[PDB]
Design an enzyme around this catalytic site. Structure first.
Site, short mmCIF file in Angstrom:
data_model
loop_
_atom_site.label_atom_id
_atom_site.label_comp_id
_atom_site.label_asym_id
_atom_site.label_seq_id
_atom_site.Cartn_x
_atom_site.Cartn_y
_atom_site.Cartn_z
CB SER A 43 -0.99 0.45 1.44
OG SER A 43 -1.83 -1.19 1.25
CE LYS A 46 -4.03 1.06 -0.91
NZ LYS A 46 -4.10 -0.12 0.61
CB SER A 103 -4.77 1.79 4.04
OG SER A 103 -3.79 0.74 3.46
CD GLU A 139 -4.01 -2.94 -3.36
OE1 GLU A 139 -3.87 -3.58 -3.19
OE2 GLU A 139 -2.82 -1.61 -3.31
CB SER A 210 0.49 -4.99 5.44
OG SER A 210 -0.76 -5.02 5.33
#
EC number: 3.5.2.6
Length: 260
Positions: A43, A46, A103, A139, A210
Site C-alpha cells: 500500500s 498509494k 489504506s 488491488e 502490508s
C-alpha cells in the site's frame, strides 16, 4: 557506520529482509540499508497514485471534486471507507484521502482507473524522475510480494527521493503539495510503525503497507521540532508466505535512525 551495524543486527534478529533509506534535508545526507534492493511496495504505492491525481488537478482545477461511483462490483478485499458509500459516490479527493489515510483498496483502484491503469501511475513516477518505481497490478493482487518478483516494487533509495520531491520538493503545485502533506499527517494506520520509534514531539506523515510474505512497510516525512525535516522509508519482508506483520521492526529501525 554505527547506524548500519545496528540496522544489520536488527535485521538479523528479525529473520527477514530490511530496507531503509533516510534523507536528512539539513545537509542532504542519506543513510541507506539495502537501499538499492527491490521490495514489494504494497500500500505504500498509494502515495504515487494519489500524487498522480493531484498532478492532474493542476490543469483540471475541479478534478478533485469529480464524483466517482462506488458500485458493489468495485469492492475488493479491504474497503473501510468505500464500503460506507456503496451505490453512492465519492469525490476523487475523498477517494485519495481514503486510499492514503485508511489504506482503502477500492479507493486505490479508482485512482488507478482515473490514471488509465497501472501504467498511468508508473508514468507519473517517470515524469518526476523516478525510474525505479513500477506499478504493474491493481488491488489486491499487487500485494502478493513474491520473493524475486519485480512487479509492484521499488527500492528504498528511490522511494525516499520521490517522497521527498512530492512533499517537501516541488514535483507538485503548492496547493497540491500541501494537500498531500495534510493527507499523510492524518494517516490513521501508522501508530505502531515508524511513529512508534520516534519522539512523541515529532510530527509524522506516513503511509504504511502490508502484504503477503509478512511484508511490512512504512514511508514517512518527519518534521522534528526545531530541525530540518527528514524522509524515512522502511521496507521489510520475510521468507514465509503467511508470515505475520512485523511493525515493531519498522519502529525499531526508526528508533535506531533517530539515535543518529
Amino acid at each position: 557506520s554505527a547506524v548500519q551495524q545496528k540496522l544489520a543486527a536488527l535485521e538479523k534478529s528479525s529473520g527477514g529482509r530490511l530496507g531503509v533509506a533516510l534523507i536528512d534535508t539539513a545537509d542532504n545526507t542519506q543513510v541507506l540499508y539495502r537501499g538499492d534492493e527491490r521490495f514489494p511496495m504494497c500500500s505504500t504505492s498509494k502515495v504515487m497514485a494519489a500524487a498522480a491525481v493531484l498532478k492532474q488537478s493542476e490543469t483540471q482545477k475541479q478534478l478533485l471534486n469529480q464524483p466517482v461511483e462506488i458500485k458493489p462490483a468495485d469492492l475488493v478485499n479491504y474497503n473501510p471507507i468505500a464500503e460506507k458509500h456503496v451505490n453512492g459516490t465519492m469525490t476523487l479527493a475523498e477517494l485519495s484521502a481514503a486510499a492514503l489515510q485508511y489504506s482503502d483498496n477500492t479507493a486505490m483502484n479508482k485512482l488507478i482507473a482515473q490514471l488509465g491503469g497501472p501504467g498511468g501511475v508508473t508514468a507519473f513516477a517517470r515524469a518526476i524522475g523516478d525510474e525505479t518505481f513500477r506499478l504493474d497490478r491493481t488491488e489486491p493482487t499487487l500485494n502478493t510480494a513474491i520473493p524475486g518478483d519485480p512487479r509492484d516494487t521499488t527500492t528504498p533509495r528511490a522511494m525516499a527521493q520521490t517522497l521527498r520531491q512530492l512533499t517537501l520538493g516541488h514535483a507538485l503545485g503548492e496547493t497540491q503539495r500541501a494537500q498531500l502533506v495534510t493527507w499523510l499527517k492524518g494517516n490513521t494506520t501508522g501508530a505502531a510503525s515508524i511513529r512508534a520509534g520516534l519522539p512523541t514531539s515529532w510530527t509524522v506523515g506516513d503511509k504504511t503497507g502490508s502484504g503477503d510474505y509478512g511484508t511490512t512497510n512504512d514511508i514517512a516525512v518527519i518534521w522534528p521540532q526545531g530541525r530540518a525535516p527528514l524522509v524515512l522509508v522502511t521496507y521489510f519482508t520475510q521468507p514465509q508466505q503467511n508470515a505475520e506483520s512485523r511493525r515493531d521492526v519498522l519502529a525499531s529501525a526508526a528508533r535506531i535512525i533517530a539515535e543518529g
